[PDB]
């Protein structure tokens, strides 16, 4: 394994001197909002392109069925 020159001091605490699932209920709305802020633009771009092109195609398909309609 490689040799990485590094100067630090690392502290770790035991898993049994800590809570397991009690900060999830506190950090849950902040995590939700941070996720949507970080990935908001791409999800919006994907949704707008997909649903707009699908709606345009479906509208034109209905128009073409009505154009041949007796």
């Amino acid at each position: 394994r490689q040799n990485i020159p590094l100067r630090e001091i690392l502290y770790q605490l035991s898993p049994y001197q800590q809570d397991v699932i009690r900060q999830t209920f506190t950090n849950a709305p902040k995590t939700f909002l941070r996720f949507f802020k970080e990935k908001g633009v791409g999800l919006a771009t994907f949704g707008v392109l997909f649903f707009g092109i699908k709606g345009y195609t479906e509208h034109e398909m209905h128009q073409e069925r009505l154009a041949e309609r007796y």
């Binding site: 771009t45 994907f46 392109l49 997909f50 092109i53 699908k54 195609t57 034109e60 398909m61 073409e64």
Partner: protein, 50 residues
């Protein structure tokens, strides 16, 4: 979005508008895979570390 649109179009019937949209989607798929990934990536490297 382009790939998901191609997935939606495959379950429809052959229609002139669906043919046109599928042709445009295939053209954009090739455009992204062969033009965007090298050239835009090179521009990003020139912007970041140039």
């Amino acid at each position: 979005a382009d790939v998901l649109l191609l997935t939606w179009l495959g379950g429809n019937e052959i229609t002139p508008i669906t043919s046109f949209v599928g042709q445009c989607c295939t053209a954009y798929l090739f455009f992204y895979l062969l033009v965007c990934q090298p050239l835009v990536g090179y521009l990003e490297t020139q912007f970041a570390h140039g």
